[PDB]
Protein backbone atom coordinates (compact mmCIF):
# COMPACT_ATOMS: atom_id res chain seq x y z
CA UNK A 1 0.00 0.00 0.00
CA UNK A 2 3.14 2.14 -0.30
CA UNK A 3 4.85 3.52 -3.40
CA UNK A 4 8.49 2.51 -3.73
CA UNK A 5 11.25 5.07 -4.22
CA UNK A 6 11.83 3.87 -7.78
CA UNK A 7 8.10 4.00 -8.51
CA UNK A 8 7.98 7.52 -7.07
CA UNK A 9 10.95 8.61 -9.19
CA UNK A 10 9.21 7.23 -12.30
CA UNK A 11 6.23 9.50 -11.62
CA UNK A 12 8.51 12.47 -10.91
CA UNK A 13 10.36 11.87 -14.19
CA UNK A 14 7.14 11.65 -16.21
CA UNK A 15 5.51 14.75 -14.71
CA UNK A 16 8.73 16.70 -15.26
CA UNK A 17 8.92 15.37 -18.83
CA UNK A 18 5.39 16.58 -19.56
CA UNK A 19 5.99 20.03 -18.06
CA UNK A 20 9.10 20.43 -20.21
CA UNK A 21 7.18 19.47 -23.37
CA UNK A 22 3.72 21.02 -22.84
CA UNK A 23 3.58 24.83 -22.70
CA UNK A 24 0.31 25.91 -21.07
CA UNK A 25 0.71 29.42 -22.51
CA UNK A 26 0.52 28.22 -26.15
CA UNK A 27 2.63 31.26 -27.05
CA UNK A 28 4.41 29.28 -29.78
CA UNK A 29 1.14 28.94 -31.71
CA UNK A 30 1.62 32.38 -33.28
CA UNK A 31 4.55 30.94 -35.27
CA UNK A 32 2.30 28.45 -37.08
CA UNK A 33 0.80 29.30 -40.43
CA UNK A 34 -2.32 31.31 -39.53
CA UNK A 35 -5.74 29.67 -39.25
CA UNK A 36 -8.32 30.85 -41.77
CA UNK A 37 -12.03 30.09 -41.72
CA UNK A 38 -10.68 24.11 -50.03
CA UNK A 39 -9.21 22.91 -46.72
CA UNK A 40 -8.48 26.37 -45.35
CA UNK A 41 -7.47 25.05 -41.90
CA UNK A 42 -4.97 22.45 -43.15
CA UNK A 43 -1.83 24.67 -42.98
CA UNK A 44 -2.46 25.76 -39.39
CA UNK A 45 -3.47 22.32 -38.11
CA UNK A 46 -0.57 20.70 -39.98
CA UNK A 47 1.83 23.03 -38.16
CA UNK A 48 0.02 22.41 -34.86
CA UNK A 49 0.30 18.63 -35.20
CA UNK A 50 3.90 18.81 -36.45
CA UNK A 51 4.83 20.99 -33.47
CA UNK A 52 3.08 18.49 -31.19
CA UNK A 53 4.88 15.48 -32.70
CA UNK A 54 8.22 17.06 -31.77
CA UNK A 55 6.95 17.60 -28.22
CA UNK A 56 5.90 13.93 -28.05
CA UNK A 57 9.41 12.97 -29.19
CA UNK A 58 10.90 14.99 -26.34
CA UNK A 59 8.44 13.45 -23.88
CA UNK A 60 9.21 9.92 -25.08
CA UNK A 61 12.97 10.47 -24.76
CA UNK A 62 12.51 11.38 -21.08
CA UNK A 63 10.48 8.24 -20.30
CA UNK A 64 12.65 6.03 -18.04
CA UNK A 65 13.97 3.15 -20.13
CA UNK A 66 12.85 4.49 -23.51
CA UNK A 67 16.36 5.77 -24.29
CA UNK A 68 17.71 2.27 -23.57
CA UNK A 69 15.76 0.86 -26.52
CA UNK A 70 17.34 0.59 -29.95
CA UNK A 71 16.91 3.57 -32.26
CA UNK A 72 14.70 1.51 -34.58
CA UNK A 73 12.43 0.49 -31.69
CA UNK A 74 12.12 4.09 -30.49
CA UNK A 75 11.16 5.25 -33.99
CA UNK A 76 8.66 2.41 -34.48
CA UNK A 77 6.96 3.15 -31.14
CA UNK A 78 6.74 6.87 -31.87
CA UNK A 79 5.53 6.46 -35.46
CA UNK A 80 2.65 4.19 -34.43
CA UNK A 81 1.58 6.05 -31.28
CA UNK A 82 2.22 9.72 -32.13
CA UNK A 83 -1.35 10.44 -33.21
CA UNK A 84 -2.66 8.72 -30.07
CA UNK A 85 -0.39 10.69 -27.72
CA UNK A 86 -1.47 13.88 -29.49
CA UNK A 87 -5.12 12.95 -28.95
CA UNK A 88 -4.40 12.15 -25.29
CA UNK A 89 -2.32 15.26 -24.59
CA UNK A 90 -4.91 17.45 -26.34
CA UNK A 91 -7.41 16.71 -23.56
CA UNK A 92 -5.55 19.31 -21.48
CA UNK A 93 -6.85 22.03 -23.83
CA UNK A 94 -10.28 20.42 -24.29
CA UNK A 95 -13.26 21.99 -22.53
CA UNK A 96 -16.60 20.33 -21.81
CA UNK A 97 -18.24 23.77 -21.73
CA UNK A 98 -17.05 24.64 -25.26
CA UNK A 99 -16.77 21.09 -26.69
CA UNK A 100 -13.63 22.40 -28.39
CA UNK A 101 -9.90 22.78 -27.85
CA UNK A 102 -9.03 26.20 -26.39
CA UNK A 103 -5.40 27.31 -26.73
CA UNK A 104 -5.43 30.98 -25.76
CA UNK A 105 -7.63 33.24 -27.86
CA UNK A 106 -10.29 32.83 -30.54
CA UNK A 107 -7.74 32.30 -33.30
CA UNK A 108 -6.47 29.16 -31.52
CA UNK A 109 -9.86 27.73 -30.50
CA UNK A 110 -10.55 24.61 -32.57
CA UNK A 111 -14.02 23.09 -32.95
CA UNK A 112 -15.25 20.20 -35.10
CA UNK A 113 -16.01 22.59 -37.97
CA UNK A 114 -12.37 23.71 -38.02
CA UNK A 115 -11.07 20.16 -38.45
CA UNK A 116 -13.44 19.46 -41.35
CA UNK A 117 -11.58 22.31 -43.08
CA UNK A 118 -8.43 20.18 -42.70
CA UNK A 119 -9.71 17.20 -44.69
CA UNK A 120 -11.41 15.11 -41.99
CA UNK A 121 -15.03 14.04 -41.67
CA UNK A 122 -17.45 13.37 -38.84
CA UNK A 123 -16.62 9.65 -39.03
CA UNK A 124 -13.42 10.64 -37.18
CA UNK A 125 -14.35 13.89 -35.45
CA UNK A 126 -17.48 12.56 -33.72
CA UNK A 127 -15.70 9.64 -31.96
CA UNK A 128 -12.74 11.94 -31.27
CA UNK A 129 -14.94 14.46 -29.46
CA UNK A 130 -16.81 11.68 -27.64
CA UNK A 131 -13.38 10.39 -26.58
CA UNK A 132 -12.33 13.82 -25.28
CA UNK A 133 -15.57 14.09 -23.30
CA UNK A 134 -15.23 10.65 -21.73
CA UNK A 135 -11.57 11.26 -20.91
CA UNK A 136 -12.31 14.70 -19.44
CA UNK A 137 -14.98 13.18 -17.18
CA UNK A 138 -12.39 10.83 -15.67
CA UNK A 139 -10.81 13.91 -14.04
CA UNK A 140 -7.38 12.32 -14.20
CA UNK A 141 -4.62 13.67 -12.01
CA UNK A 142 -1.58 14.92 -13.90
CA UNK A 143 0.26 11.84 -12.61
CA UNK A 144 -2.40 9.57 -14.11
CA UNK A 145 -2.50 11.65 -17.30
CA UNK A 146 1.24 11.37 -17.96
CA UNK A 147 1.36 7.70 -16.93
CA UNK A 148 -1.37 6.94 -19.46
CA UNK A 149 0.63 8.68 -22.19
CA UNK A 150 3.79 6.76 -21.29
CA UNK A 151 1.86 3.48 -21.16
CA UNK A 152 0.28 4.24 -24.53
CA UNK A 153 3.66 5.05 -26.08
CA UNK A 154 5.41 1.97 -24.64
CA UNK A 155 2.85 -0.44 -26.10
CA UNK A 156 4.58 -3.64 -27.29
CA UNK A 157 1.94 -4.43 -29.94
CA UNK A 158 3.01 -1.81 -32.47
CA UNK A 159 4.12 -2.36 -36.08
CA UNK A 160 7.87 -2.54 -36.60
CA UNK A 161 8.84 -3.32 -32.99
CA UNK A 162 11.78 -5.70 -32.51
CA UNK A 163 12.34 -6.17 -28.75
CA UNK A 164 8.75 -6.89 -27.77
CA UNK A 165 9.69 -8.48 -24.43
CA UNK A 166 11.84 -5.58 -23.20
CA UNK A 167 9.23 -3.00 -24.22
CA UNK A 168 6.43 -4.93 -22.51
CA UNK A 169 8.47 -5.20 -19.31
CA UNK A 170 8.89 -1.42 -19.36
CA UNK A 171 5.16 -0.95 -19.96
CA UNK A 172 4.30 -3.48 -17.25
CA UNK A 173 6.36 -1.51 -14.73
CA UNK A 174 4.50 1.66 -15.74
CA UNK A 175 1.16 -0.12 -15.30
CA UNK A 176 2.17 -1.29 -11.82
CA UNK A 177 3.04 2.31 -10.92
CA UNK A 178 -0.34 3.52 -12.20
CA UNK A 179 -2.25 0.80 -10.34
CA UNK A 180 -0.32 1.50 -7.13
CA UNK A 181 -0.91 5.24 -7.56
CA UNK A 182 -4.65 4.72 -8.04
CA UNK A 183 -4.94 2.44 -5.00
CA UNK A 184 -3.19 5.02 -2.81
CA UNK A 185 -4.87 8.13 -4.22
CA UNK A 186 -8.40 6.75 -4.87
CA UNK A 187 -9.51 4.61 -1.89
CA UNK A 188 -12.51 0.86 -11.51
CA UNK A 189 -10.52 3.88 -12.72
CA UNK A 190 -7.66 1.73 -14.02
CA UNK A 191 -10.06 -0.29 -16.18
CA UNK A 192 -11.55 2.95 -17.50
CA UNK A 193 -8.06 4.23 -18.38
CA UNK A 194 -7.13 0.97 -20.13
CA UNK A 195 -10.37 1.23 -22.12
CA UNK A 196 -9.28 4.65 -23.40
CA UNK A 197 -6.18 3.00 -24.88
CA UNK A 198 -8.45 0.71 -26.91
CA UNK A 199 -10.43 3.77 -28.00
CA UNK A 200 -7.20 5.40 -29.19
CA UNK A 201 -6.55 2.40 -31.43
CA UNK A 202 -9.89 2.93 -33.17
CA UNK A 203 -9.18 6.65 -33.56
CA UNK A 204 -5.71 5.81 -34.89
CA UNK A 205 -7.36 3.59 -37.51
CA UNK A 206 -9.90 6.15 -38.71
CA UNK A 207 -7.32 8.95 -38.82
CA UNK A 208 -4.88 6.78 -40.79
CA UNK A 209 -7.68 5.97 -43.25
CA UNK A 210 -8.57 9.64 -43.70
CA UNK A 211 -4.93 10.77 -43.73
CA UNK A 212 -4.27 8.50 -46.71
CA UNK A 213 -6.97 10.19 -48.80
CA UNK A 214 -5.56 13.56 -47.74
CA UNK A 215 -1.89 12.78 -48.44
CA UNK A 216 -2.67 11.20 -51.83
CA UNK A 217 -3.82 14.58 -53.16
CA UNK A 218 -0.62 16.45 -54.11
CA UNK A 219 -2.29 19.83 -53.50
CA UNK A 220 -2.82 18.80 -49.86
CA UNK A 221 0.26 16.67 -49.11
CA UNK A 222 2.46 19.64 -50.05
CA UNK A 223 0.71 21.67 -47.33
CA UNK A 224 1.94 19.22 -44.68
CA UNK A 225 5.31 19.33 -42.94
CA UNK A 226 8.28 16.97 -43.38
CA UNK A 227 7.75 15.59 -39.87
CA UNK A 228 4.03 14.96 -40.44
CA UNK A 229 4.70 13.28 -43.80
CA UNK A 230 7.28 10.97 -42.21
CA UNK A 231 5.45 10.10 -38.98
CA UNK A 232 2.02 9.55 -40.54
CA UNK A 233 3.38 8.09 -43.79
CA UNK A 234 3.33 4.42 -44.73
CA UNK A 235 7.11 4.30 -45.25
CA UNK A 236 8.83 1.42 -43.44
CA UNK B 1 18.41 16.30 -46.85
CA UNK B 2 19.07 14.91 -43.37
CA UNK B 3 15.53 13.97 -42.34
CA UNK B 4 13.16 10.09 -37.40
CA UNK B 5 18.38 11.45 -36.76
CA UNK B 6 14.89 14.83 -34.37
CA UNK B 7 16.06 9.85 -32.31
C1 LIG C 1 -2.25 19.22 -30.93
C2 LIG C 1 -2.78 19.42 -29.72
C3 LIG C 1 -4.08 20.34 -29.48
C4 LIG C 1 -5.31 20.11 -30.05
C5 LIG C 1 -5.62 18.75 -30.77
C6 LIG C 1 -6.63 18.73 -31.68
C7 LIG C 1 -7.45 19.94 -32.04
C8 LIG C 1 -7.64 20.16 -33.53
C9 LIG C 1 -7.80 18.98 -34.36
C10 LIG C 1 -6.85 17.76 -33.92
C11 LIG C 1 -5.40 18.22 -34.17
C12 LIG C 1 -7.03 16.23 -34.50
C13 LIG C 1 -6.84 16.10 -36.03
C14 LIG C 1 -7.75 14.97 -36.49
C15 LIG C 1 -5.40 15.76 -36.49
C16 LIG C 1 -5.33 15.85 -38.06
C17 LIG C 1 -3.85 16.03 -38.54
C18 LIG C 1 -3.75 15.84 -40.09
C19 LIG C 1 -4.45 17.01 -40.82
C20 LIG C 1 -2.28 15.82 -40.53
O1 LIG C 1 -4.36 14.63 -40.45
C21 LIG C 1 -6.13 15.48 -33.72
C22 LIG C 1 -6.02 16.31 -32.30
C23 LIG C 1 -7.03 17.50 -32.55
C24 LIG C 1 -3.80 21.58 -28.68
C25 LIG C 1 -2.88 21.33 -27.43
O2 LIG C 1 -3.61 20.56 -26.46
C26 LIG C 1 -1.67 20.61 -27.77
C27 LIG C 1 -1.99 19.24 -28.45
O3 LIG C 1 -0.76 18.58 -28.72
UniProtKB/Swiss-Prot annotation, chain A:
It comes from the Eukaryota. The keyword Transferase does not apply. It is found in: Nucleus; Cytoplasm. Residues 61-79 are annotated as: Interaction with coactivator LXXLL motif. Nuclear receptor for calcitriol, the active form of vitamin D3 which mediates the action of this vitamin on cells. Enters the nucleus upon vitamin D3 binding where it forms heterodimers with the retinoid X receptor/RXR. The VDR-RXR heterodimers bind to specific response elements on DNA and activate the transcription of vitamin D3-responsive target genes. Recruited to promoters via its interaction with BAZ1B/WSTF which mediates the interaction with acetylated histones, an essential step for VDR-promoter association. Plays a central role in calcium homeostasis. Homodimer in the absence of bound vitamin D3. Heterodimer with RXRA after vitamin D3 binding. Interacts with ncoa1 and possibly other coactivators, leading to a strong increase of transcription of target genes. This is Vitamin D3 receptor A. The gene is vdra.
Amino acid sequence: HMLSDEQMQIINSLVEAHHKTYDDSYSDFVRFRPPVRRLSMLPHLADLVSYSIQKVIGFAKMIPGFRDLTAEDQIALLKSSAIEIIMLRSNQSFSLEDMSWSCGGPDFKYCINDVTKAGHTLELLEPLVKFQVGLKKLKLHEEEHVLLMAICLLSPDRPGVQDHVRIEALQDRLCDVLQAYIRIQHPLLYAKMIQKLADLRSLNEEHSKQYRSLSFQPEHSMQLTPLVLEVFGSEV
Amino acid sequence: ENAXXXX
